[PDB]
Structure formats: C-alpha cells, structure tokens
Amino acid sequence: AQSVPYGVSQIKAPALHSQGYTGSNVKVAVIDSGIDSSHPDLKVAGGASFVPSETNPFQDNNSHGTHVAGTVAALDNSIGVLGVAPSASLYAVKVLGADGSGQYSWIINGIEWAIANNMDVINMSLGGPSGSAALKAAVDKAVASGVVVVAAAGNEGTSGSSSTVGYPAKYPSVIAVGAVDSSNQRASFSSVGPELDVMAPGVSICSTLPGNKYGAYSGTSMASPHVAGAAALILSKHPNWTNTQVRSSLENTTTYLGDSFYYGKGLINVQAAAQ
Ligand SMILES: [Ca+2]
Ligand SMILES: [Ca+2]
C-alpha cells in the first residue's frame, strides 16, 4: 500500500519511472539535518556529519533532512511514499543540528565534502538572508566541478519591489526553487525575485519522518527536492549531460505560470526535460 505524493505526479516523474528511468547510479547529497537511515522507505548510501555535537549523519534529530530525502528518493516498494528518483544513491550530509540551524562553516564544509566525493546533485533546503565569499566560492566550485546544485529560494514572501530570495539560492550558479500548491498557484510564503528559476510543489508535501513515520510539511524546502530528484531522473536517461545541460533542459521545458519575479520560468516538467 504505497502512495504517490501529488508533487511527484505534478512534475510528471511517474512517466519516466515506467520507462525504467528512476535515477539509478546518481549520487544526490541532501545537505541538511541528517537522514534517518533506519527508515524502511529510505536507503542511505553514505554521508558525513559536520555538526560538532552530532557526529552521526544517519541520526536526524530534527526531521527536516529525512522529509527532504524522502521527496528525493523514498523507495518504490509496497510501503510508505514514492520519491521522485527512488533508485538514487542518497547521501546524508548533516550540517544542521537538532534545532534545525547550523553555522556557515558547517554548511560550506558540507558542500566541500560533496564536491570531493563526486556528488552529481546537491540539494540545499536551507538558506539565510546573508552570503559570504566562502559560501559563493563553495557553490561556484561545485558547479565548475560538474555538480548540479539546487537550493530553496526561501520562505520570505513579497516585499515591495525587492528580491526576497536567500542564499545560496541567490547566486547565479545555484538553481533557486520556489513553491506552488496543487493548483499551480504560488504559495504566499515563497520568496520572489529575479533570481528565482523554477517552481515545484511545496504545500502540504507528504514524505518520510524519523521513526518509521510519514508527515506533510510546507515550504520551499519541500519544493527544492522535487527539482534535485528531477535532475537525477534526467541524468539516469542522459548520463553524458553536463550540469549546465541539465539546468537548461529543466528551465526551458517548464509550464509557464505568471511573471518570472514570482514564478521563475514556471513549473518543472521532468517528462519534457528528460527528452
Ligand atoms: Ca515506498
Ligand atoms: Ca540562483
């Protein structure tokens, strides 16, 4: 009794699953609060922890990382939910603690680890109001090394005529993801700005939670993994594509929904992006 979350269907992933493209052999690093590797609906391939006080990357004391990982790769079996790319090798890069916050050094150290270990895709469902020379350098170095870097735009809403997109999503190298609901309308919390690239489902998203549980969360943090998962599906069909060709295909085959200041290029359609 396996349920497919609306969001997985909304970006058209099941169409690729049926063709045999499920993200096999693609390494996706979920840079977050850790992932509960004991979840029956997840298979964590590796990981590392950069939080000084939480040395086990496979222990998610928050719940954020496990939910985010489940959107990316919850297994295709007869239990729980289904992920966007269920055959992806999932890596837990724990940079946030039990309180859901982390220090930039920890996050940057996590991005660095991801580059060194050849992650194909990096998902950052995190972000702050300020950036740094070191934060830009890390995400720029990952993209130069062929990694697809996806990040949550932020949950700051609108503000006059200002961009409310956070970092690292604000850097040109990072694909910034905003959130939409089931009806393709922008979630009122979703950050806006000319830095927004794509939109993905982000309201009441059902996924995995520590302790063999399932729960729904809302935020651009939930939108982001739909796009990191999409990137993995596309690489399983076209492993020769560079990170640049993966991003172009994603941005260029979206379903146009309003002005780009609010919706980026629109809703991703991985069926059209995978070719
Ligand atoms: Ca499942
Ligand atoms: Ca960006």
Q: Which ligand is nearest to the CA of 136?
A: 2
For residues 169 and 151, the answer to whether their CB atoms sit within 8 Å is: yes
CATH number at residue 124: 3.40.50.200
Distance CA 179, CA 66 (A): 19
Nearest to 128 by CA among 95, 163, 166: 166
Question: Which tokens go with 156?
Answer: 């700051």
Which residues have CB less than 5 Å away from ligand 2 (the ion)? 174, 176, 195
With b for 16 or more beta-carbon neighbours within 10 A and e for fewer, the 21-44 pattern comes to bbbeebbbbbbbbbbbbebebbeb
Catalytic, out of 37, 190, 221, 236: 221
Q: Which ligand is nearest to the CA of 42?
A: 1
Is residue 221 annotated as a catalytic residue, yes or no?
yes
Catalytic, out of 39, 64, 67, 226: 64
Distance (angstroms) between ligand 1 centre and the Cα of 79 equals 5
Amino acid identity of residue 178, one-letter, is G
Amino acid identity of residue 138, one-letter, is A
Structural domain that includes position 31: 1-275
HSE-up (13 A, CA, CB side) for residue 124: 33
Q: Which ligand is nearest to the CA of 214?
A: 1
Distance (angstroms) between ligand 2 centre and the Cα of 198 equals 10
Distance (angstroms) between ligand 2 centre and the Cα of 208 equals 27
Rg (CA), the chain: 16
Quick one: angle between helices 243-252 and 220-237, nearest 10? 120
Amino acid identity of residue 39, one-letter, is H
Distance (angstroms) between ligand 1 centre and the Cα of 72 equals 12
- What is the three-state SS of the chain? CCECCHHHHHCCCHHHHCCCCCCCCCEEEEEECCCCCCCCCCCEEEEEECECCECCCCCCCCCHHHHHHHHHHCCCCCCCECCCCCCCEEEEEECCCCCCCCCHHHHHHHHHHHHHCCCCEEEECCCECCCCHHHHHHHHHHHHCCCEEEEECCCCCCCCCCCCCCECCCCCCCEEEEEECCCCCECCCCCCCCCCCEEEECCCEEEEECCCEEEEECCHHHHHHHHHHHHHHHHHHCCCCCHHHHHHHHHHCCECCCCHHHHCCCECCHHHHHC
Is residue 32 annotated as a catalytic residue, yes or no?
yes
Amino acid identity of residue 242, one-letter, is T
Widest CA span in the chain: 48
**Residue 224 β-bridge partners:** none
With b for 16 or more beta-carbon neighbours within 10 A and e for fewer, the 189-225 pattern comes to bbbbbebbbbbbbbbebbbbbbeeebeebbbbbbbbb
| Total structural domains within the chain | 1
Distance (angstroms) between ligand 1 centre and the Cα of 157 equals 33
Catalytic, out of 32, 120, 181, 197: 32
* 207 CB-near residues (< 8 Å, 6+ apart): 5, 66, 67, 68, 70, 71, 74, 81, 214, 215, 216, 217, 222
Distance CA 40, CA 207 (A): 13
Task: Specify the resolution in Å.
Answer: 1.8
Nearest to 95 by CA among 53, 133, 142, 137: 53
Amino acid identity of residue 11, one-letter, is I
